[PDB]
Design an enzyme around this catalytic site. Structure first.
Site, PDB file in Angstrom:
ATOM      1  N   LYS A 104       0.867  -1.170   0.000  1.00  0.00           N
ATOM      2  CA  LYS A 104       0.000   0.000   0.000  1.00  0.00           C
ATOM      3  C   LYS A 104       0.906   1.222   0.000  1.00  0.00           C
ATOM      4  O   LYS A 104       1.787   1.350   0.852  1.00  0.00           O
ATOM      5  CB  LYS A 104      -0.886   0.028   1.252  1.00  0.00           C
ATOM      6  CG  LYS A 104      -2.016  -0.983   1.254  1.00  0.00           C
ATOM      7  CD  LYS A 104      -2.976  -0.720   0.110  1.00  0.00           C
ATOM      8  CE  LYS A 104      -4.173  -1.644   0.166  1.00  0.00           C
ATOM      9  NZ  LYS A 104      -5.121  -1.323  -0.926  1.00  0.00           N
ATOM     10  N   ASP A 110      -0.192  -0.468  -4.722  1.00  0.00           N
ATOM     11  CA  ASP A 110      -1.550   0.066  -4.813  1.00  0.00           C
ATOM     12  C   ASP A 110      -1.551   1.397  -4.061  1.00  0.00           C
ATOM     13  O   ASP A 110      -1.301   1.435  -2.856  1.00  0.00           O
ATOM     14  CB  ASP A 110      -2.542  -0.903  -4.155  1.00  0.00           C
ATOM     15  CG  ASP A 110      -3.995  -0.512  -4.381  1.00  0.00           C
ATOM     16  OD1 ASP A 110      -4.273   0.668  -4.677  1.00  0.00           O
ATOM     17  OD2 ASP A 110      -4.873  -1.390  -4.242  1.00  0.00           O
ATOM     18  N   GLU A 149      -1.203  -0.200  -9.233  1.00  0.00           N
ATOM     19  CA  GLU A 149      -2.654  -0.145  -9.047  1.00  0.00           C
ATOM     20  C   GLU A 149      -3.164   1.173  -8.466  1.00  0.00           C
ATOM     21  O   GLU A 149      -2.727   1.602  -7.396  1.00  0.00           O
ATOM     22  CB  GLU A 149      -3.108  -1.305  -8.147  1.00  0.00           C
ATOM     23  CG  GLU A 149      -4.620  -1.411  -7.965  1.00  0.00           C
ATOM     24  CD  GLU A 149      -5.030  -2.651  -7.192  1.00  0.00           C
ATOM     25  OE1 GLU A 149      -4.286  -3.651  -7.235  1.00  0.00           O
ATOM     26  OE2 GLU A 149      -6.105  -2.634  -6.559  1.00  0.00           O
ATOM     27  N   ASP A 192      -9.143  -0.451 -10.107  1.00  0.00           N
ATOM     28  CA  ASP A 192      -9.850  -1.162  -9.046  1.00  0.00           C
ATOM     29  C   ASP A 192     -11.139  -0.428  -8.675  1.00  0.00           C
ATOM     30  O   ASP A 192     -12.203  -0.724  -9.224  1.00  0.00           O
ATOM     31  CB  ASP A 192      -8.907  -1.284  -7.834  1.00  0.00           C
ATOM     32  CG  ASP A 192      -9.547  -1.966  -6.636  1.00  0.00           C
ATOM     33  OD1 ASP A 192     -10.716  -2.383  -6.718  1.00  0.00           O
ATOM     34  OD2 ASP A 192      -8.858  -2.082  -5.599  1.00  0.00           O
ATOM     35  N   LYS A 194     -13.114  -8.083  -8.095  1.00  0.00           N
ATOM     36  CA  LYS A 194     -13.392  -8.327  -6.686  1.00  0.00           C
ATOM     37  C   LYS A 194     -14.803  -8.869  -6.562  1.00  0.00           C
ATOM     38  O   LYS A 194     -15.774  -8.206  -6.936  1.00  0.00           O
ATOM     39  CB  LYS A 194     -13.237  -7.044  -5.864  1.00  0.00           C
ATOM     40  CG  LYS A 194     -11.795  -6.577  -5.742  1.00  0.00           C
ATOM     41  CD  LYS A 194     -11.646  -5.466  -4.716  1.00  0.00           C
ATOM     42  CE  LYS A 194     -10.217  -4.957  -4.676  1.00  0.00           C
ATOM     43  NZ  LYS A 194     -10.043  -3.889  -3.655  1.00  0.00           N
ATOM     44  N   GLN A 207     -11.164  -6.953  -0.900  1.00  0.00           N
ATOM     45  CA  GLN A 207     -11.968  -5.812  -0.461  1.00  0.00           C
ATOM     46  C   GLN A 207     -11.844  -5.695   1.058  1.00  0.00           C
ATOM     47  O   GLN A 207     -12.741  -5.166   1.724  1.00  0.00           O
ATOM     48  CB  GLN A 207     -13.437  -6.060  -0.826  1.00  0.00           C
ATOM     49  CG  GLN A 207     -14.290  -4.809  -0.906  1.00  0.00           C
ATOM     50  CD  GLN A 207     -14.096  -4.069  -2.215  1.00  0.00           C
ATOM     51  OE1 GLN A 207     -14.610  -4.481  -3.258  1.00  0.00           O
ATOM     52  NE2 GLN A 207     -13.343  -2.976  -2.172  1.00  0.00           N
TER      53      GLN A 207
HETATM   54  O1  LIG Z   1      -7.676  -1.228  -2.894  1.00  0.00           O
HETATM   55  C1  LIG Z   1      -7.528  -2.440  -2.633  1.00  0.00           C
HETATM   56  O2  LIG Z   1      -7.228  -3.326  -3.469  1.00  0.00           O
HETATM   57  C2  LIG Z   1      -7.694  -2.906  -1.153  1.00  0.00           C
HETATM   58  C3  LIG Z   1      -8.828  -2.209  -0.328  1.00  0.00           C
HETATM   59  C4  LIG Z   1      -8.677  -0.695  -0.110  1.00  0.00           C
HETATM   60  C5  LIG Z   1      -9.929  -0.224  -0.139  1.00  0.00           C
HETATM   61  C6  LIG Z   1     -10.755  -1.222  -0.457  1.00  0.00           C
HETATM   62  O3  LIG Z   1     -11.978  -1.178  -0.311  1.00  0.00           O
HETATM   63  O4  LIG Z   1     -10.096  -2.307  -0.973  1.00  0.00           O
HETATM   64 MG   LIG Z   2      -6.798  -1.794  -4.928  1.00  0.00          MG
END
Ligand SMILES: O=C(O)C[C@H]1C=CC(=O)O1
Ligand SMILES: [Mg+2]
Ligand SMILES: O=C(O)C[C@H]1C=CC(=O)O1
Ligand SMILES: [Mg+2]
Lengths: 366, 366
Positions: free
Chosen positions: A162, A191, A217, A242, A266, A294
């Site tokens: 992250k 991400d 991402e 995403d 997702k 998620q």
């Molecule tokens: O972004 C992601 O892949 C992970 C996570 C962060 C917010 C969300 O709802 O998913």
């Molecule tokens: Mg993401």
């Protein structure tokens, strides 16, 4: 196999350690357990994670839309009228996890009714997926320590870092530390959760050009339209969309517009019926796709692996299937087990899971 | 539900009256009956129509590729490993109807094993489709007479006129005669089967501008690339691509390139697994789709309606489900029935059909 009732039960389970990222934080799994009851006595289940900073849904809102709109509109349909349910729910805009949960619970019920796993009904390409863990914000030394702990404990060899913090060097230093600590023994990608500007994103990726990142991402907001498109065109690796591609129509607009070059799937937002639509669209267009997380509990993770194992295009990449580990507890009678960096789809019919009555009674908040 | 054997039996049934069109003619149904045998004693069936002037397949070639390549590669898989079968067959290029027949026979076997119709397993949106009949070449007066006979006898209210002849006025006169004879009581569209040049096609459509044609299908060759694209951009109505879009990749190339603005889905070439991929791609891109006819026998027609009724996007248009009527006989124990211009999906499990042993024995040619 007729639907006689659809329930939405809110529950809350504290996180042992909160997951932090650019767009928000999760300190507890304040989810909604969705149950589809049939006239055969079968109950299909799934969960809906409210992510206000991603879709705008709230726990209260999810329960409300299901009890007030979806349940009344779907009762009476059979488990083999998925397209009718899909079309009826589509009359209502948004509410992604609420819709997805109902769809997955229907599939769970269908699988139980037919003595078949959701995975095999969807395609049954394989029986397991490699696991990717999302590393949330934290002190640089602590993030590396977390990665080491997770890799040694579960055999997980893929990590999605992250990022999206300032200064940018904070995150690039973390990624470099990870690559230096593990070498080419691990897969790494990032991400940003819309945290950086497109300009900052480019500088960050350029600094990490020698770290062999597999994907980038949502580094910057997709809504910073033109700069986002320029950035995507400047990067070597695929750029995974995403939160900006919650529906197939968004996939088409973002991909043809040049704001996305890879797609996150997702199950929390597109379930199984919708996720098949995304997979087929992405495969047809010729884009890479990755099963995302998620910030799912074990119920949602069982769904992710059910779908991901059904197709070759989704199983060729590791799936984000391990963040449920940070929860202090969960609702399954039999917890998910990750070993050798892999997660097998459940052997039982439907999702292959069962809700522990005592756990639900303890954590429900209604 | 393990596949123990896959057979390919060639058979031939004379046509009462040959169907003629720009790219060729069909005087007999020289098809291949494909059977998937399971360890449960269940036998799924489907047919593969060799169309050398469309895909390049021959009756002998279809039997050969199935016996020599596909059967050996699929035996051992279960009916819930469709994506494995899909991926393995994909290793071989082309051979569309051979692949589609195996896929549909697998779905038929699956449905029988689960006591579910293929239609409901695919989505179960509705239980019937309106019927569209393809009118083959013939004297102008005779084509109108055929349309009148078919409409009064079966209640069919949609006709796809075969065009692509010279002079162009021959065909435009036929379409005008039909519109004058039936008024707005019928839907009309045209299919040129690559017979006209793009320039001739435009002149023809301009002459018929007042006839309210719903679609223009393959008026000129898609391989006359640039003129084809110009033509598609000049027409008001959607331009259906058929023989030029046998695979999802072709759909993407032709649609993004501007050579197609609507998509024909034919179960004869993409079966059910592949057809779902086409439907989802077309829906995601935002294009109209119509269930077409591969000059199918009743076996293939049962497949078309099974798929078409499963989704809203396919059932919103009439499906080409009646050309089997021109065959002198067929292989089903219970013939398909068209009434009030509609065809219902079979009520039985799988495709809801059964092969008459005596018919197969009489018409097989092996
Ligand atoms: O972004 C992601 O892949 C992970 C996570 C962060 C917010 C969300 O709802 O998913
Ligand atoms: Mg993401
Ligand atoms: O073109 C159609 O829709 C009808 C038919 C003509 C050739 C073929 O194989 O399909
Ligand atoms: Mg055609």
């Amino acid at each position: 196999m007729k639907i006689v009732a659809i329930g939405a039960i809110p529950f809350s389970i504290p996180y042992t350690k909160p997951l932090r990222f650019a767009s928000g934080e999760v300190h507890a799994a304040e989810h909604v357990l969705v149950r589809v009851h049939t006239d055969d006595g079968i109950v299909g289940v799934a969960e809906a994670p409210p992510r206000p900073f991603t879709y705008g849904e709230t726990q209260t809102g999810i329960v409300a839309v299901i009890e007030q709109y979806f349940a009344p509109a779907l009762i009476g349909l059979t488990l083999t009228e998925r397209e009718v349910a899909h079309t009826r729910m589509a009359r209502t805009v948004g509410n992604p996890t609420a819709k997805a949960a109902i769809d997955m619970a229907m599939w769970d019920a269908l699988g139980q009714s037919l003595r078949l796993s959701v995975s095999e009904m969807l395609g049954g390409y394989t029986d397991r997926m490699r696991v990717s863990h999302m590393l949330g914000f934290d002190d640089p030394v602590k993030m590396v320590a977390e990665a080491e702990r997770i890799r040694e404990t579960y055999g997980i060899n893929t990590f999605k870092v992250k990022v999206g913090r300032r200064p940018v060097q904070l995150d690039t230093a973390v990624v470099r530390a990870l690559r230096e600590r593990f070498g080419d023994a691990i897969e790494l990608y990032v991400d940003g959760n819309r945290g950086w500007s497109a300009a900052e994103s480019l500088r960050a990726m350029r600094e990490m050009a020698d770290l062999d990142l597999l994907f980038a991402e949502e580094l910057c907001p997709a809504d910073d339209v033109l700069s986002r498109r320029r950035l995507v065109g400047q990067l070597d690796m695929p750029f995974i969309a995403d939160e900006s591609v919650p529906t197939p129509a968004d996939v088409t607009r973002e991909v043809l517009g040049g704001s996305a070059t890879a797609i996150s799937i997702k199950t929390a937002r597109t379930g199984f019926t919708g996720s098949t639509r995304v997979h087929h669209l992405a495969e047809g267009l010729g884009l890479d796709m990755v099963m995302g997380n998620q910030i799912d509990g074990q119920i949602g993770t069982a769904c992710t692996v059910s779908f991901g194992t059904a197709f070759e295009r989704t199983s060729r990449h590791a799936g984000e299937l391990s963040n449920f580990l940070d929860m202090s507890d969960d609702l399954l009678t039999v917890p998910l087990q990750i070993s050798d960096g892999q997660l097998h789809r459940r052997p039982g019919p439907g999702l292959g899971i069962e809700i522990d009555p005592d756990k639900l009674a303890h954590y429900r908040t209604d």
